[PDB]
């Protein structure tokens, strides 16, 4: 058989040999867990 000496890359198909060099570029941020508990309350004026 043919040996597929596949390397580094991220998020790619089985036909792809490698895409990365030493640091693959793409990453994603989380969604900020328990954010729903946090409200960012607006301020108000005092009549003064």
């Amino acid at each position: 058989t043919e040996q597929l000496r596949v390397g580094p890359g991220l998020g790619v198909g089985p036909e792809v040999a490698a895409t990365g060099g030493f640091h693959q570029f793409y990453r994603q941020l989380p969604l900020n867990i328990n954010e729903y508990k946090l409200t960012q309350l607006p301020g108000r004026l005092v009549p003064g």
């Binding site: 597929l4 596949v6 991220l10 089985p14 036909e15 792809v16 994603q28 989380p30 900020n32």
Partner: protein, 437 residues
């Protein structure tokens, strides 16, 4: 600056005339090819993101074109049933030294597991003790008679071997307490023995279900259990000058778990024919000593067991040795090597006794010899599975034997081989018959 190896766009594998099947379908049918790299949810360690999205061509066998999930589990819905526990009685007074026959009452729709219960009367001899394992030492033979035919038979030695070979470890300590094994029972106290009966029934035997369709046994065709008990003279040891008080009646019964079914199956089992795969046993021994015409006895350097009476597909055999006179438990390893013949042809290269005791059992349970000296030989990849994984059919053979090479003995030991073989029992038209004899 030079073009990186493989090109500025990451290098790819070509699609040639040798690439087939998954290495192509995985890419064209890739279910997650559509998302614009938004496949994963949030709140994670980045390495987990990397792992989840780092599949290669070697993964087309594992995670491409999925068939199932590990988490979208389904369960199967089952026919409604419930179990009631009935106590069956012996027709007459239960005594030691005779055959005590218990008739079943056909209480339920299926018979599941069965257990025999007996107490030991308090003979009242302060220096007296009972047999090492009264849970088995008393049961010379147990048979299950189904109509006119016998489905299976077992005796004291097989039962103890079964436990020492197919009782899974987390149950042994509880079982030893249950059958009062490895303990000394004195004759001052009345002891309660509860003994499981390793029939072709559901559990206790590495089996699955194999229920008895009791409803379709018609009229005067019933289930009888034959409990052949040894006389007390072989069971209880008394000090010199102590006279056996004797037992005129025994408190004994049989616990049978009866299952009642929903109407659908309730009638099907009563009416429709059913065939079950069952396990039957045989016992073939050979003496370590030989006798001649003048009555002289000589020890055998080489002793073989003729398995000529065994005519069934065998899953495995079990080999023990024990002193001829001490007809009791606690077995001894007296075998240096052994080999197997079919019609005088070798089946495998002679192996040492340690192979049969320590190695061969790997196939199945209880590959150990803490106090046990039980060795086996299998004809199947596993012994325990209900599935008929493999067997050797002895029906067409005329000269089968295991030849055991031993050191010359001073104690008259006997080598005893058990076979466990497959058969079928059919319940049809009110009758129960075996397919093969």
């Amino acid at each position: 600056v030079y073009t990186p190896p493989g090109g500025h766009t990451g290098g790819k594998f070509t699609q040639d005339i040798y690439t087939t099947d998954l290495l192509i379908a995985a890419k064209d049918e890739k279910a997650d090819k559509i998302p614009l790299d938004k496949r994963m949810d949030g709140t994670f360690s980045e390495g987990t993101f990397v792992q989840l999205l780092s599949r290669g061509p070697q993964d087309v066998y594992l995670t491409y074109n999925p068939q199932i999930s590990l988490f979208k589990r389904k369960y199967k819905r089952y026919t409604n049933f419930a179990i009631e526990n009935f106590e069956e009685r012996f027709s007459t007074v239960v005594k030691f030294g005779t055959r005590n026959i218990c008739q079943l009452s056909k209480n339920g729709d299926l018979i599941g597991n069965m257990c025999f219960r007996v107490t030991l009367p308090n003979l009242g001899i302060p220096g007296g003790t009972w047999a090492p394992t009264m849970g088995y030492n008393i049961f010379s033979t147990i048979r299950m008679r189904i109509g006119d035919t016998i489905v299976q038979s077992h005796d004291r030695v097989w039962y103890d071997i079964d436990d020492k070979m197919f009782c899974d470890s987390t149950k042994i300590q509880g079982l030893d307490e249950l059958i009062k094994r490895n303990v000394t029972l004195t004759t001052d106290q009345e002891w309660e023995l509860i003994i499981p009966l390793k029939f072709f029934c559901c559990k206790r035997n590495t089996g699955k279900q194999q229920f008895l369709p009791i409803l379709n046994m018609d009229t005067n065709i019933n289930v009888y259990l034959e409990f052949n008990l040894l006389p007390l003279n072989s069971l209880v040891t008394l000090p010199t000058g102590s006279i056996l008080p004797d037992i005129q009646s025994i408190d004994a019964s049989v616990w049978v778990d009866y299952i009642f079914l929903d109407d659908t199956e309730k009638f099907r089992f009563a009416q429709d024919p059913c065939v079950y795969l069952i396990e039957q046993t045989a016992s073939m021994d050979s003496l370590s000593y030989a006798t001649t015409t003048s009555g002289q006895t000589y020890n055998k350097t080489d002793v073989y067991v003729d398995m000529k009476e065994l005519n069934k597909p065998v899953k495995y055999v079990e080999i023990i040795a024990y002193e001829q006179g001490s007809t009791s438990f606690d077995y001894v390893d007296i075998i240096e090597s052994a080999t197997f013949y079919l019609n005088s042809d070798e089946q495998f290269k002679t192996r040492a006794g340690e192979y049969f005791s320590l190695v061969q059992p790997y196939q199945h349970f209880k590959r150990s010899d803490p106090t046990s000296n039980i060795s086996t030989f299998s004809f199947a990849l596993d012994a325990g599975s209900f599935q008929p994984n493999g067997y050797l059919n002895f029906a067409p053979y005329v000269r089968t034997r295991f030849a055991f090479k031993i050191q010359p003995q001073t104690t008259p030991h006997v080598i005893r081989l058990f076979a466990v073989c497959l058969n079928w029992v059919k319940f049809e038209s009110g009758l129960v018959k075996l397919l093969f004899n």
